[model samples]
Target: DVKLVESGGGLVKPGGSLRLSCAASGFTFRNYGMSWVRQTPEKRLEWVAAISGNSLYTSYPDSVKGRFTISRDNAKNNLYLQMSSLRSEDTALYFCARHDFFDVWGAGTTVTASSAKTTPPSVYPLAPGSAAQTNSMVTLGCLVKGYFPEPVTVTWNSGSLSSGVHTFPAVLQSDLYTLSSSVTVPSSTWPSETVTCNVAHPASSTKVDKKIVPRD
Candidate 1:
């Protein structure tokens, strides 16, 4: 018997990317799997991906699982989604559900998107193990090559974000019209969960999605 809840009403701007937070506080993050699903404005459900407890394993559904990720803050019993690269056609409401059946439970699970959103950064590849993988720590960078003066939010998907001034370097671009952001998501967590990077801006209509995986 576990419980999960989404942070907002599920309505996002139909023309741009949106960012929403889903918190899973009643269950052990390491024991249960977390997932994100999409519901169009008309309210249709689509599987996005799964975040395995303690192992951070990700499975993208053929066409879009690539567009989403599931990450968690085990200590806080939380889960999150960092969505991106959204166009007007990408508008939809999303929900965060527990993987009760190696899939999703049918009710009492949802996360909402806001119309106020922005562009997100690209996912960077982490250098592999000690030979590439070990207790090594890498500062994964989130970069936008063609935009500037955009306010960005970089967060860890484990749960509630750590308190601090969410700020990153800004660059002026002539060709890209983009922005940059970064977060230090651990490799240990990457193996069993997703490391999500989310960017928000007023100029852009939706929040884009990006994911970082520890090199295998």
Candidate 2:
């Protein structure tokens, strides 16, 4: 049940640098070495760099022989890949591979040769004044937009009620994405109660929060 989570990845320009961190869980970190693998735009999986379980040695491709490095923190259960002097050919999907095999991988993070950083996500309540009001049923929508890396999780909360949520099929624009979600509750019980929506993604500094109260 090991899982890998990428903490840092995004656009960089020529001559720029990028550091990607992969956090691992569900297994003893030191028992397995982690490898950083990449899928190029041409869709070839390339071995980038890796640190052995003994934490004493590393390996990398010739192109990156001098500019790339691999390191790890056994205490934090994390593996890191550092690359400097990036080029357009460096743009690719980066993944953290567990134990040398492709057994488990982080959801790939895209690194691109561009000047843009990940834009903060926008979160808001949707309207008919943001909710459809009636005596018995009320439907609330949370709209989240302008996010990147293509993976976002939305959650809904109201009083003691809470549920995991998923966005509608996202729409991609330029390098970002947009999506929305809805939750229904009894209208009579919802008024005056605070409803909250939280949107989280790998690229954002923090989750976006949208809160609103419905009225009769």
Candidate 3:
């Protein structure tokens, strides 16, 4: 009854490196070895690498023989898979398996090898309905798009306005990711007040800011 947890997924450019980890629990890890497996986008499942938990011995498939390495940490009950000089064909869902006849498997981590570079997110504010009405209440939307890694943080900032901000989960579009957050305010306040939409990513510098006045 061993459970394996993956370190999640990521996008890497060709010639880059990727390090994946799996933490084992619910069973004595050293009693059984661990296998690192992958299923390509084509649905082809292959044994990419493995590690003997007790002995620390490792092995890899011929295709990945020189580029992939497997290691383990007995203290942490964890297994590691490291690959370097990746190619586009390396994109796949990777998993960790209990070495005993490969019976137990972990949740897959999608790793994509591509030549595309990480792009900075584009953000803007959208004012709903007609901006000509001054006294009307309107909903403002902060749209963030074209980001990578699928995880992003969107925040709304207003000067002492107690308005509530609603943030949506990031969604994948084409190959990039997009996120949106919204807040509602009175149209009359739009003329004198400014709102900001800030988007942050782990791979980006601090956060990206977009300011909107909604003055139309």
Candidate No. with top lDDT? 3
Model 1 local distance difference test score: 0.53
Higher-scoring candidate on lDDT, 1 or 2: 2
How would you encode candidate 2's per-residue C-alpha lDDT over 10-101 as one tens digit per residue?
A: 77877899999999999888988789998986789998987888689888889888887999999999899888988878889999998747
Can you write out model 3's per-residue Cα lDDT over 41-67, one digit (the tens) per residue? Answer: 678999998878685588887899989
Write down the TM-score of every candidate.
Answer: 0.42, 0.57, 0.60
Question: Which runs in model 1 stand beyond 4 Å of their true positions?
Answer: 8-17, 102-216
What's the lDDT for all of these models?
0.53, 0.78, 0.79
For candidate 2, the TM-score is: 0.57
**Backbone clash count, each prediction separately:** 27, 2, 0
Query: In terms of TM-score, which candidate is stronger, 1 or 3?
Result: 3
Q: What is candidate 3's local distance difference test score?
A: 0.79
- Candidate 1 minimal-lDDT segment of 10 residues: 106-115
State the lDDT at 151 in candidate 1: 41
